[PDB]
Structure formats: structure tokens, C-alpha cells
Design an enzyme around this catalytic site. Structure first.
Site, PDB file in Angstrom:
ATOM      1  N   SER A  13      29.315  64.036  65.354  1.00 29.83           N
ATOM      2  CA  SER A  13      28.649  63.297  64.295  1.00 29.83           C
ATOM      3  C   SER A  13      27.146  63.231  64.549  1.00 29.83           C
ATOM      4  CB  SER A  13      29.267  61.915  64.169  1.00 29.83           C
ATOM      5  OG  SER A  13      28.616  61.180  63.156  1.00 29.83           O
ATOM      6  N   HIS A  16      33.543  69.627  64.650  1.00 31.19           N
ATOM      7  CA  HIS A  16      34.152  69.364  65.949  1.00 31.19           C
ATOM      8  C   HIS A  16      33.404  70.041  67.083  1.00 31.19           C
ATOM      9  CE1 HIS A  16      37.168  69.759  69.192  1.00 31.19           C
ATOM     10  NE2 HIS A  16      37.649  68.625  68.715  1.00 31.19           N
ATOM     11  N   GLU A  70      32.970  61.274  30.978  1.00 26.71           N
ATOM     12  CA  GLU A  70      33.070  60.166  31.908  1.00 26.71           C
ATOM     13  C   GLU A  70      31.733  59.943  32.606  1.00 26.71           C
ATOM     14  OE1 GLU A  70      36.452  60.432  34.458  1.00 26.71           O
ATOM     15  OE2 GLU A  70      35.996  58.591  35.558  1.00 26.71           O
ATOM     16  N   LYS A  90      37.962  50.027  62.027  1.00 26.10           N
ATOM     17  CA  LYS A  90      36.760  49.910  61.220  1.00 26.10           C
ATOM     18  C   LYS A  90      36.925  50.647  59.904  1.00 26.10           C
ATOM     19  CE  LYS A  90      31.853  50.889  61.631  1.00 26.10           C
ATOM     20  NZ  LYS A  90      31.336  49.550  61.320  1.00 26.10           N
ATOM     21  N   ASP A  91      37.531  51.829  59.951  1.00 21.65           N
ATOM     22  CA  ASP A  91      37.826  52.544  58.721  1.00 21.65           C
ATOM     23  C   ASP A  91      38.884  51.813  57.912  1.00 21.65           C
ATOM     24  OD1 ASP A  91      35.988  54.586  59.195  1.00 21.65           O
ATOM     25  OD2 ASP A  91      37.436  55.760  60.349  1.00 21.65           O
TER      26      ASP A  91
END
Ligand code: HEC
Ligand code: HEC
Ligand code: HEM
Ligand code: HEM
Ligand code: HEM
Ligand code: HEM
Lengths: 237, 370, 74, 47, 370, 74, 237
Positions: free
Chosen positions: E196, E192, E262, E218-219
């Protein structure tokens, strides 16, 4: 109800422990008397180590009794001599058989019965030693008996204990009383395998917290002393 | 640089006329973390199955290395927890925290979060009071018409308590402290815009001081008293509050002659038990709690505190008699010398709050002309 | 919020001393104990009488309950 | 058999094994006290 | 007024040249909440006892009303979870997120938190790969001298896996997502202060835009694809990733011919399996993960991204071959055609990272003179 | 951080329109598809050849493994 | 190893369901054949409701078999006719008895065996129908048998199935094949009692998500259209 008294003990004191010698004879009682109809399932012989018996000695009792263990390679089960990991021999496979072996009544477990009954020991010791003749104007079915300490004063408790009902190892008197002492000492250990150690931390705590508490209370009063001694004034024109 | 948010616990303004009461305001942070820490290590050997859970407790108290303590640091810890709250909350009345409306409501949602949490915590060991302790309380929600039978059967996982009832609590019970753990921060957030609230009730903006030397150690001193009063009980009287019966295995086909849940409900449970009607007391129960949300519309005095409202003190400490009475009267059975009490004590509770504390400020304003 | 923009202050003096230059607990017994009593005399009258009645209602609550289980002449 | 939560696996030609030719040079009776009673923790050494 | 902190998810500046990749950056918030939500309702009927746990799963898939889905929304959900990460993380290399040193390290501690979490999640049902899946991995910690036997026995609750091993995980496994739930906020906090990081790698301060209309939906569009790709598997191929063997009951006295945990370990498990030595590969394992903390001291280029470093793309997508290879090579057994691979592929992994990506910027700077 | 104190801008104009005044998907097929191919021609050569070898190593990895379990003449 | 083929089914299609008529005859097989040595413990007759049998009909089978339930008031246990809540009759009380009833070998459970074996059905159907004479140069102990699909090609599987080994209700052919069809259809239902419903949500999902996904993709392109059509310029002096 009936309130039992506060009988003293060798362990009532807040830094008092259990007379392990008293426990040693107490365990004899459960096997000779109470293990016919009381299902103590939360205990094994190994927990007696460091308490009343040794490894090899207590193991001699595991060799004594047979225990149902082991799926045979045939696909069946069998009986073996038990070991120290094995819990006590359960008298009866299920509760209902015990009700059938009695006048419809059930024996409770005796693992945590002390801490699951008001007064604990003092209830129990006075319970056995509270048998007397019924009073006037009372009637009871067969199998039931009188004992004031039990709620309702009516119980299917056959008298389990009496003077010279068995004998002990070292040879102390097998009175109805001394036996009643070791057994209640024994059961408190059941729901407290930690008594010997609870008091140990029971004591370590005080001589720390009793020792710290002033010091922290001083470090408090140390820092705050600026404001416990702070003065002011008011000087405008 | 997440070092600037942790100034609220280091370099925060706060008053200087502060008592020892506000130790309790932070002990919950110590109770909660400790209790979580205890319970977390504790659930390393719990089992969520009827056939083994009670035994799985015995797996601890006997066979674990010093684990037997953990049953009691946690359990009786939960009693010391509540001892803080009703010394933390009655405070806000005796000093006037409750004007901070954005905070006081948060102080409620914790309580119903906990008192519904703890209800799920006494039940795990299948004590023969676990079962009935879950039966009676949960049975009441059948009091509602046309849905009470549904939600209750819906929560019982059937038609009555069973294995399916257990696991559904153990997850609901292992979780909410974390929900509390974050709500704790929220409870401090709305504070942070305004700060604390002295005993006098005066806005003490002029005399706000640091926090790292002074109240830190002061709280630690309180934590010591907490750990002391906690270490005492576990070491010297762990059977005190935790009722004896709960060491009994569960069996639906037999009850004790006397029922009572853990001691702390009892002020509230007694209110319901007073009412012979079923539903007519249930709504009084949550109302007795949710009245707290309703108090701050009853701050009649244009003062705040009660150190400067002597008449309020006459009522306030009288309220404590009622609670501490209903505490005891609740834990005792239903007979004539006691029914006569709760029919009054229940009414007294609602009466002292909604009539006489308001009446005070309406008078005390007139005693001093505003 | 923090120090700096709270409020206004004018014509106020503050005197204070190190902790090291003064005993931590001076006049604890000598001056504290009256202040304890003075603190007591201002609070007991509005705190005790509830608990006074509690002790009585705790008393009579048992005695009447004690008698009721004891029988009547009949 | 099952033991410590692990398995429990329990002479004429066994002694015929040439120890030096083997990977771990290890005579048989170094591994046992009795010849005709074999014991080992039954766990594959590799993985 | 806690409405000002939730501007970071409403009125936050953020770029505009943003791909569909950064859907994945927030799907974890949806995976995690969903996965928690699923698992929480799921643990309403789990049991932490050996004698009933595997059966207690069957209590779900058969007798619960639409609960059988929840085994797979959760389980295969955990696969879709990891599909985000190694599309979330390789991103940061292909774009240059890793310069944010205060954030990138946080991105590691999650991964080891999860990959040690998930290891505790596959084991609960006692699948006959649960047991050995817990044996092999945990056995390796005996590789250490003089303490390896202690910590392993210490965690096994004895000398080998048992009931006591189970419950100790179920609490350690039911809890860490909440620890992740808060660390998630931390991971966004250090963000923050800087925001980004575009694909180009350029400081796009000039073109930072709102967030509520644009990237929210969009998400959500990505979440739809997630729920789609999740609903597909559970409905059409739930047996795909979750190996068949895990429906077998546990039995220590028999193994499968082929072992593999896995699928997602397999890039990492293969690195160890390559090394014939025991310890000589273990330290390579965590080093293969903890190299990520070591990359940002290897940002040789004074550029940031790799959209403008074509040679880096030649290496980067070559790394994916190695991982996706070790993925497959790991899940296959130990034989000559495959050992020859992992002895190279393991070295290639460390080689591409610590030699050739640095070598690029040292050259690409020289190709353009700075 | 927020809008207002980020950086400086000078002599820049921005034109833009409502969404309602324009179709959502104009020239999707007409113009998008070449742009897809152009996006493709710039990336395939640095992405595929790893996966090309992977397909082969995935192939030869099985065949040699397939032969090894098949016996030898002896 | 040996890889079974991909035999088609009435349910292989991604919106295909199970032929419940095939299940109805399949259940006959497990009771007549496999329930002598296979312990399906994770199933009860009630789950067959809405699948192959009805309440009363399937209940007729619960009346057929005796089940050990109920502690008698004497304290013992007994046998009763089962009910719909009762799981299937376990053949043998423990695994070891099954090893004893065989040549040291154990029958696995068949509840989740399909999903716990690669290929599932196609393994099983080809397993039974993969019996043949052993090849040259092979030797096997007694009790063991040959079947290529089993790992090691060596198994203590007595041949359970053969043509005209029993008869079914409606009267369809009791070939080795049709029987092998219904049984594998039956076992897939074991580890999937949800197949009839998985596809239902299997279908509801698509005509929603296939319907939403464009719309959300439009609402995306709706809002972004401001920037999908945004122009600029640069006009300093
Ligand atoms: C005849 C078999 C038998 C013997 C021997 C026996 N018990 Fe009992 N025990 C019972 C039965 C039956 C009850 C049921 C009492 C009841 O239902 O209230 C019982 C009840 C009890 C209780 C429960 C007390 C309560 O509040 O119900 C205790 C404690 C107890 N016994 C202790 C002992 C002790 C101590 C001894 C040896 C001195 C002993 N038992 C020997 C069968 C036995
Ligand atoms: C005569 C008793 C008996 C009968 C009847 C029987 N089984 Fe078997 N079954 C066994 C035994 C014994 C094994 C052990 C195989 C082994 O140890 O490798 C076994 C193994 C299996 C397996 C294990 C396969 C695997 O991949 O592990 C399956 C599946 C199976 N049986 C299914 C069936 C089917 C289908 C039928 C009817 C066509 C049937 N059983 C009838 C005794 C029986
Ligand atoms: C405010 C939070 C909580 C309350 C009020 C609460 C309440 C209680 C109480 C009173 C007991 C006593 C049972 C006894 O003494 O026999 C108990 C037991 C238990 N608690 Fe909780 N608890 C809380 C939080 C937790 C947490 C955080 C955990 C785990 C991290 C936990 C796990 C357990 C378990 C497994 C038991 C069973 C032990 C027992 O019954 O003795 N609880 N709970
Ligand atoms: C886990 C539970 C809780 C935590 C962690 C917590 C935390 C705190 C802390 C640290 C303070 C500051 C200390 C102080 O003011 O003396 C505080 C104050 C306060 N608390 Fe709690 N608290 C909790 C529960 C509650 C509850 C149940 C109430 C119920 C009303 C409440 C109401 C308040 C109020 C009104 C204040 C304001 C203090 C003031 O006015 O000066 N809190 N809380
Ligand atoms: C990142 C977090 C987690 C991971 C990686 C994870 C991993 C897993 C996986 C892969 C399974 C599959 C078991 C199966 O399919 O049979 C599983 C099962 C399980 N999970 Fe977790 N899990 C996570 C979080 C949780 C949470 C949050 C809960 C509860 C709130 C939970 C409770 C359970 C339970 C009870 C099971 C047993 C069900 C089963 O084995 O089928 N897990 N876990
Ligand atoms: C539950 C786990 C996680 C959550 C909730 C989470 C959350 C987020 C979110 C919402 C973003 C912004 C979206 C974006 O940047 O595209 C982000 C970005 C980022 N994440 Fe995650 N993340 C998680 C795991 C990880 C992991 C495992 C890494 C490993 C390196 C990581 C490293 C980063 C970095 C470096 C960024 C910066 C984005 C940029 O540079 O533009 N995160 N994270």
C-alpha cells in the site's frame, strides 16, 4: 411399435441436398390440404425465399389470405391481407377448438414434428401409405382409424391424402406417392432451414481438417523427434 | 510481473512417457471456454419465460445469421464434454491418479457441480422431456421423510414445475461454469505442488521436461480431434444424442410412452430404476458417485498403476462393461429381460470397486512378497 | 517448483539430435506396424472379453425382449 | 406510426416559407414527392 | 496447502498511519459480493422479454416474500458503490497512489467496465428512461464517420432498440462482475509486489504491521457504515436517486420533457452536453476518463502526497467543485444560465488536471530547491 | 514479500501495553476535541472556498434561471 | 412547472404508517369512479387482505364482476365471476380504445403513478383540488380543461370528483377533500405494499446498528489501543 424402413432420398447422402423443385410442389399441399387443421406457427412466407418461391410470387400468397393485425384508432382490431413477415395462417385460434373440430383428438404442429418423431421422414411417408383394412378381431370407435405406424395402431386421423385429390402447377402426377414425397421433403426443411448450408460447412470442414490434421500431426512429430530419437548410457567407474 | 505465475503453463516440469490420453486433461479447458463462449452468445436471444422460451429457441435456429449452429456446438458440445470426463477419470484409476487425495476430491465436486448443472441445461427449451426430465429426478427428493416435500416444493417455486421453476435454473445454470472456471485453477493448484502422474505410476522426478513446444501442440492436436468430432456431429448428425422429443412443446397433460433423460445419466439413473424401493436406491445413486471420494482408502497395492497389475486390468475393463451396460439398460424401459440385469449390474458396480480391486493388491503384494 | 532442486543425478549421458537432421516419419510402416501388434497382443485379452459379453448381452437382451411382446398360444 | 422501432410522422401556406431566411435553406417539395403527403423520421435533430 | 496465498489477507505487511479512508478500498469487495449476491437471487424472477420484464419486476415487489427489498439493496447499492469509487479514486490523487503505474491502469479498466456495465443495468426494467437512457448514449456512437451507423445498428439488433437489444445486455450485464471478480485479484496482485501507499507518500517499509486484528475489524466497521447508509436509503428514501420516471412503462412514442440518466453519469454527460458539436465532445468524454491513464506522466513534484503540498490542496478540492457542479449542471436542462457554466466547467476539468497540478510541483520543487 | 528482509533498523526501542490494561476511550472528550479543531484549522481554508462558491453558483444558477422563465414587459 | 407543497400525512413520519381505515374508503373510490377509465393491471383483490378487507368480504367483490377466463372445451372463451387471484377488471381492452373514448387523450395507469411523478401524493391531492376558472387570455379546445399542476396547464381531464358524488360505507363525509385524502393514501399503497413492513425493518435496523456501532467502534479502539498508546526512543552511542 413399428420401425419404418430407411427409404432413400435425394438428401440422405452426407453431402446431398434437397430437391427444391420437390419442395415447390410440396408447399402447395400444405395450403390445399393440411392447413385446414395443422397449425404451423414457427414459419413465414419469407423463409420460402431462395428456397421454392420468389419475393413477389410468395407475396402473392400473403395477399391471398386475411390476417388479424392492427389495433384500429377506434380501439378495435380488424383483418388485412398478410405480408412476408407474417407467419402462416393458424387454422384454429386455440387447441381446444381443434379437439372440438375432431373426435376429441388434437392435430399436432408440423414445424418440428419430423425431428420430434423417431425416423422422421420415413415414419411420415410410410404413415400415410400404411393405411389398410383393419385385421380380424379388432374394433374401433367412429372417427378413429387404423394405421400400423402410429403407436397403439389407433388414430383419429381422417385419410387426408388420396390419388387425384388435387392438382399441381407444372402438372406432374398427383399420385398418393409423389405427393407423399414432396410433403416429407417439405417438412424436413421446416426443422432444417439450413440443410443447403449445413453441408456447405459440412464440406469446407473436411478439406481443411483433413488437410490440417496431418500437418499438425507432423509439427507434433517434428518437435518430438528429438525424443523419438534420444539415446542414453551409463558410465560410472 | 504476473508473468511468473504463467510459467506453470509454459516452463513447467512434466514427464515424458506421456500418452495421448492426457490430451483429454486439457480439452475441458477448451470445452469449457468454448461451451461458455458458445452459450454466452447463445443467451443473447434466449428468453426465460414459458410462453416464449421454446419459441425463443426457434428465433435462433431460423432467423439468426449462422446462429443455428450455436445450438449444437453448445448442446452436443456438452456431450463431447462428458466423453472427456469418463475418459479423464477412469484414467486416474487405470493409472493411479487417485492417490493425490487433495486433488481427487476436487475432481468430484466438479462432477456433481456439472451433473447438477447440465440437469439445468437440458430443461430450458421446454421439450416435453425438459419438464418430465425435471419432474422425475427432482421428485425423488421427496423420498426423504419430513423435509422431502419441503425442499422440493421450495425449489419448484410452488407445488409443481412452472415458469418460476425455469428462471431459477437459468441463473443457476448460467453461472456455475464460472464457479468451475475458478475451481479449475484450484484443481491445478494442489497439482502444482506435486505435478502430474505417469502411466507407470513411478515418481518420474528425474525426467521432467518443458511444456511450451511439446504438450501445447499435443493438446492442440487433441483439440483438433475434439473440434473434428464436434464439427462432425453438428454438421452430420446433430439429432443423434439430443433426443427427438425435446423439439416438442411442453405440456404437463401428456407424457411420452418412454421416458429417459439424456444419455449420460443413464449409467446412474439405471441404478435407481433397478431398486423397486424409492429411497433404498437414491442413497445408492450419490454413493455410486461419492464412492470416488471413498476409493483412495482402498489403494491396497503398494504399487500405483495398473499397467503393472494385469489382474486389475481384468477387473477395470470389466467395470466399463457395467457402465456402458447401465448406460444402455438405463435408456430402455422396465421389463423382465432388463430388470434382471440392473439388479445385478448395480450390484456389480459396487462389487467390483469395494471388493475385488482391493483384493488384487492384497494378493499381488503376496504374489511378489511385500 | 521448477528445474534445479528436484533430485540427484550421477554418471548419466544424453545424446540427441536436431529435428531438421532427421525425417519426421522414418520406419513408420516398416517398424511401427509390428509394434502396434505387439502393443495389441499385450492388451486385447484383458479388454475384449468384457466387450465380448457385452455384444452377447446386447444380443440376448433384444431377442428375449423381442419374443416377450410376441404372443403366446392362448 | 411505429416503424423500425421508431416513430413515423405523417401546402397553401407551407410554400409561403422563405427558404433563405430559414436555418437549413430547404424548399418544401425538395422534401416530398407528393405535396399533400408529408413524411419524415420523427426524431428531434438536437438530441 | 492453499493456506499460504491467503496470508495476503491475514499476515500481510501494511502501514500504521492509516486513515478511515481505506475502509473504502475494501468495501467494493463487500459491495461487489453483496451486489452480486443480491442480483443473483434477484434474477430468479427477472424476465428478458419486453412484454413481461417490467411486469416481472412487479412480480417481485408485490408477490415475493421480502423480495421487494432486493430491488433496492441492489439498485441503490449501485449508488453506494459509486460513492466509494470517487472517494476511492480522488484519494489516489490526494495521496499519490497513481505512481503505481501497473496498478493505476487497472483502476481504469474497472471503471469503464462498470460504467458500461451499469449502463446495461438501469435499462432492464423498461422505465421510459431505460429506453431513452439507452437511446441517447448509444446514439452518439453514430458520431463516427463511415462506421458509426454500423456498430450502433449492429448493437441495436436492428435499426432501433427492441427486445433484441434487451437480452443482449442482460447477459452482458449478468457477467462482467465476475470478470471484475477476477480482475479484482489482479488489481491486488500488482499491489502485492509493493503493498500500500500511506497518506504521507513516504515508503513506510519500516512500519509495516499485521492485518487480521487491525484492518479487518476496521473494514468491518466501515462495512457497517456502508450497510447502515445502505439500509437507511432502502428503508427511508429508496425513491431518492432512482428517478421516478423509471416506474413508467416503456413507450417510444412519447418522451419526458426532461431527460437525464442516473445521477452518476452527470459529471461526464454534462461535458458532452456542453459541446454544441456532436463528435467534438464525444472524444472529450472518454478523454475525461482516460486522462487518468495520462496523469502519471504528470507527477512533477519529486514528493508524492498532497498532505505536504498545500497548493495542490487548493486545486484538488477545487476540482471537486467542478465534478459536483457538472453532476448538478448535468442533471438540469439546456438553458442560458447553465450553458455558460458547462462551457467553463468542462474546460476547468481538463485545465486543473493538465496545467496547474503539474505547475505546482515545478514550483514547489523551486520553493524548496530541487 | 513479508517481514524479515525489508530494510535495516538500528538503535530503536518500542514500548507498548496490552489493551486490557487500559481503557479503550480515555481522554476522548478531554483531549480529542481540541485535536479535532486543530485538524480542522489546518484544512478548512483549502477545502471550503470551493464549496463556498458552489453554494453561490448553486444559488445564482437558480435565480437567473428562475427569472428567465418569468416574462418581460412586452 | 409548479411545485406542490409538502402536505403532511398520517405516514410522512419516518416511523409513521398508513391509516388503513382511510384505505378502506379509498378503495370504494377507485371502483365507483376511476375504474371506468383507469387500467390498474398490477394488482389483485387478494393483496387487499390484511390491509383493508378480509378474505370473504373482498371475495364478494370478485363475485361481483365478470372476468374473461377459460378456453371452453368447444374451443371458445367465456365470462365468469372473478376470484381473489384475478387482477382488477381492466376498463378497456387496449390503450387505443381509451384514446377513442376520450378527446384523443390517454388515461395513464395508476399502479405506480405516485412514485412515477414528482412529489407523488402531494401532486395528486393538489391536482384534483387545483381546478379553477381559466385565467384571462387563455383558450382551450373542447375536452381539454385547466389545472395548473399538470405540465402545460392543459389537460383532457374531465373533472372526476366533486362534493357528494357518491357515498361511503361507515358514513363519513363525501367531501371533495376527504375523498381526495383516502384516494392518495390508496395509491401510495399501490406502489408500496410494504410500507407497514418497511418501517418495521426500518426500526429493527436502528436499535441494532445503533447498538452494534459503538461496540464495534470499541473493539476497534480496543485492539488499536496498543498503538494509540505506543512510545519510542532512540539510543545509539
Ligand atoms: C382432417 C384435418 C387434417 C387433415 C386434412 C390433415 N391432418 Fe394430420 N392430423 C390431424 C389430426 C386431427 C391428427 C391427430 C392424430 C392423432 O391424434 O394421433 C393429425 C395428425 C397428423 C400427424 C401426427 C403423426 C402422429 O404421430 O401423431 C402428422 C405428421 C400429420 N397429421 C400430417 C398430415 C399430413 C401430411 C397431411 C396431408 C397429407 C395432413 N396431416 C392432413 C388433422 C388433419
Ligand atoms: C372520465 C374518465 C376519467 C376519470 C373518471 C378519472 N380519470 Fe384521470 N385521466 C383521465 C384521462 C383521459 C387522463 C389523460 C390526461 C392527459 O392526457 O393529460 C387522465 C389523467 C390522470 C392522471 C395523470 C396525471 C399525470 O401526472 O400524468 C392521473 C394521476 C389521474 N388521471 C388520476 C385520476 C384520479 C385521482 C381520478 C379521480 C379523482 C381519476 N383519474 C378519474 C380519465 C379519467
Ligand atoms: C457445463 C456447462 C453446461 C452444460 C452441461 C449445459 C447444458 C446444456 C445443454 C445440454 C443444452 C442443450 C439444449 C438443446 O440442445 O436444446 C443447453 C442449452 C442452453 N444453454 Fe446450457 N449448459 C452449460 C453451460 C451453459 C452456459 C455456459 C451458458 C451461457 C453462457 C448456457 C446457456 C444455455 C441456454 C440459453 C440454452 C438454451 C438453448 C437450448 O436449449 O437449445 N449453458 N445447456
Ligand atoms: C472442468 C473440469 C476439469 C478441468 C479444467 C481439469 C483440468 C485438469 C488438467 C489440465 C489436468 C492435467 C492433465 C492431466 O493430468 O492429464 C488434470 C489432471 C487431473 N484431473 Fe482434471 N480437470 C477437470 C476435471 C476433473 C475431474 C472431473 C476429475 C475427477 C476425478 C479430475 C481429476 C484429475 C486428476 C486426479 C488429475 C491428476 C492427473 C495425474 O494424476 O497425472 N479432473 N485436470
Ligand atoms: C456493478 C454491477 C452492476 C451494476 C452497476 C448494476 C446496475 C443495475 C441497476 C442500477 C439496477 C436498478 C434497476 C432498478 O432499480 O429498477 C439494476 C437492475 C437489475 N440488475 Fe443489475 N447491476 C449490476 C450487477 C448485477 C448483477 C451482478 C446482477 C445479477 C447477479 C444483476 C441483475 C439485475 C437485474 C435482473 C435487474 C433488474 C431489476 C430492476 O431493474 O429493478 N445486476 N442493475
Ligand atoms: C471492484 C473494484 C475494486 C476493488 C475490488 C479494489 C480493491 C482494492 C483494495 C482492497 C485496495 C487496498 C485498499 C487501499 O489501498 O486503501 C485497493 C487499492 C487501490 N485501488 Fe482499488 N479496487 C477497486 C477499484 C479501483 C478503481 C476503480 C481504481 C481507480 C483508480 C483503483 C485504484 C486503486 C489504487 C491505485 C490502489 C492503491 C492503494 C494505495 O496506493 O495505497 N481501484 N484496491
Amino acid at each position: 411399435e413399428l420401425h419404418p424402413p430407411s427409404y432413400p432420398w435425394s438428401h440422405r447422402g452426407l453431402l446431398s441436398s434437397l430437391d427444391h423443385t420437390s419442395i415447390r410442389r410440396g408447399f402447395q399441399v400444405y395450403k390445399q390440404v393440411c392447413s385446414s387443421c395443422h397449425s404451423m406457427d414457427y414459419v413465414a412466407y419469407r423463409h420460402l425465399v431462395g428456397v421454392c418461391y420468389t419475393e413477389d410470387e410468395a407475396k402473392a400468397l400473403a395477399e391471398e389470405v386475411e390476417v388479424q393485425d392492427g389495433p384500429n384508432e377506434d380501439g378495435e382490431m380488424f383483418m388485412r391481407p398478410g405480408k412476408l413477415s407474417d407467419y402462416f395462417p393458424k387454422p384454429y385460434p386455440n387447441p381446444e377448438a381443434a379437439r372440438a373440430a375432431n373426435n376429441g383428438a388434437l392435430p399436432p404442429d408440423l414445424s418440428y414434428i419430423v425431428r420430434a418423431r423417431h425416423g422422421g421422414e420415413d415414419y411420415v411417408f410410410s404413415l400415410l401409405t400404411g393405411y389398410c383394412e383393419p385385421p380380424t378381431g379388432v374394433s374401433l370407435r367412429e372417427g378413429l382409424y387404423f394405421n400400423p405406424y402410429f403407436p397403439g395402431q389407433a388414430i383419429g386421423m381422417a385419410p387426408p391424402i388420396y390419388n387425384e385429390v388435387l392438382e399441381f402447377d407444372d402438372g406432374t402426377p398427383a399420385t398418393m406417392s409423389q405427393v407423399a414425397k414432396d410433403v416429407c421433403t417439405f417438412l424436413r426443411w421446416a426443422a432444417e432451414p439450413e440443410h443447403d448450408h449445413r453441408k456447405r460447412m459440412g464440406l469446407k470442414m473436411l478439406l481443411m481438417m483433413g488437410l490440417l490434421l496431418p500437418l499438425v500431426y507432423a509439427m507434433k512429430r517434428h518437435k518430438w523427434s528429438v525424443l523419438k530419437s534420444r539415446k542414453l548410457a551409463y558410465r560410472p567407474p | 510481473l504476473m508473468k511468473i505465475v504463467n510459467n506453470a503453463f509454459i516452463d513447467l516440469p512434466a514427464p515424458s512417457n506421456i500418452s495421448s490420453w492426457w490430451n483429454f486433461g486439457s480439452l475441458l479447458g477448451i470445452c469449457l471456454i468454448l461451451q461458455i463462449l458458445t452459450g454466452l452468445f447463445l443467451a443473447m436471444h434466449y428468453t426465460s419465460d414459458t410462453t416464449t422460451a421454446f419459441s425463443s429457441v426457434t428465433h435462433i435456429c431460423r432467423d439468426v445469421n449462422y446462429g443455428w449452429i450455436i445450438r449444437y456446438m453448445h448442446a452436443n458440445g456438452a456431450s463431447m464434454f462428458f466423453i472427456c470426463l469418463y475418459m479423464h477419470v477412469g484414467r486416474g484409476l487405470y493409472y493411479g491418479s487417485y492417490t493425490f487425495l487433495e486433488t481427487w476430491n476436487i475432481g468430484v465436486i466438479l462432477l456433481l457441480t456439472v451433473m447438477a448443472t447440465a440437469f439445468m441445461g437440458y430443461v430450458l427449451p421446454w421439450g416435453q422431456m425438459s419438464f418430465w426430465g425435471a419432474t422425475v429426478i427432482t421428485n425423488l427428493l421427496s423420498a426423504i421423510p419430513y423435509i422431502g416435500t419441503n425442499l422440493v416444493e421450495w425449489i419448484w417455486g410452488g407445488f409443481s414445475v412452472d415458469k418460476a421453476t425455469l428462471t431459477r435454473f437459468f441463473a443457476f445454470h448460467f453461472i456455475l461454469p464460472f464457479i468451475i472456471m475458478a475451481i479449475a485453477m484450484v484443481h491445478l493448484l494442489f497439482l502444482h505442488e506435486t505435478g502430474s502422474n505417469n502411466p507407470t505410476g513411478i515418481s518420474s522426478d528425474v525426467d521432467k521436461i518443458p511444456f511450451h513446444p511439446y504438450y501445447t501442440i499435443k493438446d492442440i492436436l487433441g483439440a483438433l480431434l475434439l473440434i473434428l468430432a464436434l464439427m462432425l456431429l453438428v454438421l452430420f448428425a446433430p439429432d443423434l444424442l439430443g433426443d427427438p422429443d425435446n423439439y416438442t412443446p411442453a405440456n404437463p397433460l401428456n407424457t411420452p410412452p418412454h421416458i429417459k433423460p439424456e444419455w449420460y445419466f443413464l449409467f446412474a439413473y439405471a441404478i435407481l430404476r433397478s431398486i423397486p424401493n424409492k429411497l433404498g436406491g437414491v442413497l445408492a445413486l450419490a454413493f455410486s458417485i461419492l464412492i470416488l471420494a471413498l476409493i483412495p482408502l482402498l489403494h491396497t497395492s503398494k504399487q500405483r498403476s495398473m499397467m503393472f497389475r494385469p489382474l486389475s486390468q481384468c477387473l477395470f475393463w470389466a467395470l466399463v462393461a457395467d457402465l456402458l451396460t447401465l448406460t444402455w439398460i438405463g435408456g430402455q424401459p422396465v421389463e423382465h429381460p432388463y430388470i434382471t440385469i440392473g439388479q445385478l449390474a448395480s450390484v456389480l458396480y459396487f462389487l467390483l470397486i469395494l471388493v475385488l480391486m482391493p483384493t488384487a493388491g492384497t494378493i499381488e503384494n503376496k504374489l511378489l512378497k511385500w | 517448483r521448477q528445474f534445479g532442486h528436484l533430485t540427484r543425478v550421477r554418471h548419466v549421458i544424453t545424446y540427441s539430435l536436431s529435428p531438421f537432421e532427421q525425417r519426421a516419419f522414418p520406419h513408420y510402416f516398416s517398424k511401427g506396424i509390428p509394434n502396434v501388434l505387439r502393443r495389441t497382443r499385450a492388451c486385447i485379452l484383458r479388454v475384449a472379453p468384457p466387450f465380448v459379453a457385452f455384444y452377447l448381452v446386447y444380443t440376448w437382451g433384444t431377442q428375449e425382449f423381442e419374443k416377450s411382446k410376441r404372443k403366446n398360444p392362448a | 406510426f411505429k416503424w423500425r422501432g421508431k416513430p413515423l410522422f405523417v401546402i397553401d401556406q407551407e410554400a409561403a416559407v422563405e427558404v433563405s431566411q430559414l436555418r437549413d435553406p430547404q424548399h418544401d417539395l425538395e422534401r416530398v414527392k407528393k405535396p399533400e403527403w408529408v413524411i419524415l423520421i420523427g426524431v428531434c435533430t438536437h438530441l
